UniProtKB/Swiss-Prot annotation, chains A, B:
Binding partners and assembly: Dimer of either two alpha chains, or two beta chains, or one alpha and one beta chain. The S100B dimer binds two molecules of STK38. Interacts with CACYBP in a calcium-dependent manner. Interacts with ATAD3A; this interaction probably occurs in the cytosol prior to ATAD3A mitochondrial targeting. Interacts with S100A6. The S100B dimer interacts with two molecules of CAPZA1. Interacts with AGER. Interacts with PPP5C (via TPR repeats); the interaction is calcium-dependent and modulates PPP5C activity. Interacts with TPPP; this interaction inhibits TPPP dimerization.
Binding site for Ca(2+) 2: 62, 64, 66, 68, 73
UniProt effect for mutating residue 91 to A: Decreased zinc-binding
N-acetylserine found at: 2
Primary role: Small zinc- and- and calcium-binding protein that is highly expressed in astrocytes and constitutes one of the most abundant soluble proteins in brain. Weakly binds calcium but binds zinc very tightly-distinct binding sites with different affinities exist for both ions on each monomer. Physiological concentrations of potassium ion antagonize the binding of both divalent cations, especially affecting high-affinity calcium-binding sites. Acts as a neurotrophic factor that promotes astrocytosis and axonal proliferation.
The keyword Ribosomal protein is assigned to this record: no
Gene3D superfamilies reported for this sequence: EF-hand
Organism for this UniProt entry: Rattus norvegicus (Rat)
Keywords recorded for this protein, A-Z: Acetylation, Calcium, Cell adhesion, Cytoplasm, Metal-binding, Nucleus, Repeat, Secreted, Zinc
Induction: Up-regulated in periinfarct ventricular myocardium.
Name of the gene encoding the protein in the UniProt record: S100b
Chief location bin: cytoplasm
Protein name: Protein S100-B
Amino acid sequence: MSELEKAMVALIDVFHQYSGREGDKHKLKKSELKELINNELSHFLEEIKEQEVVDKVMETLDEDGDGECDFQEFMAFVSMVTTACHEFFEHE
Amino acid sequence: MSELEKAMVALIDVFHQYSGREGDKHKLKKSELKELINNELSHFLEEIKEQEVVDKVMETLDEDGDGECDFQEFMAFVSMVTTACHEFFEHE
Ligand SMILES: [Ca+2]
Ligand SMILES: [Ca+2]
Ligand SMILES: [Ca+2]
Ligand SMILES: [Ca+2]
């Protein structure tokens, strides 16, 4: 079928199962965010080393500076990866 | 590997190949937008009937009202589907 239908389900599905690991299922905590980047998304970003890097990066995706990242803020991070990544992904 | 890596590649990959159908590879035209919804995304939206519906909907994702939808605007539509869709996708 349409690839977007599978990606839309996978994007939402991963958030529900991944965020459901802790008793917090309706919001994402600061510690969980570090784990998400450490999982295997280091390909887009490889500057993780000191805790200050996560804090500096966390402020960038924070739009209302609420101190926490909800599902709406998580979508903003996805936009950051597409805009930051180059379109030279065409040929290897 | 991480599901997000496959989805990030599929989201960008589909845009390059799908938008490359017409000589316009750097921007999306109004007619192409109707085809995208008509493809098989009618699941999220099933109110397509008169051309006015597309125009009313097109204005909603338009942020700068430039009269055309670029790659940045396309991302906004994805956010609209996630916010509009309910989270009751858990159990069938
Ligand atoms: Ca959580
Ligand atoms: Ca925030
Ligand atoms: Ca195009
Ligand atoms: Ca526009």
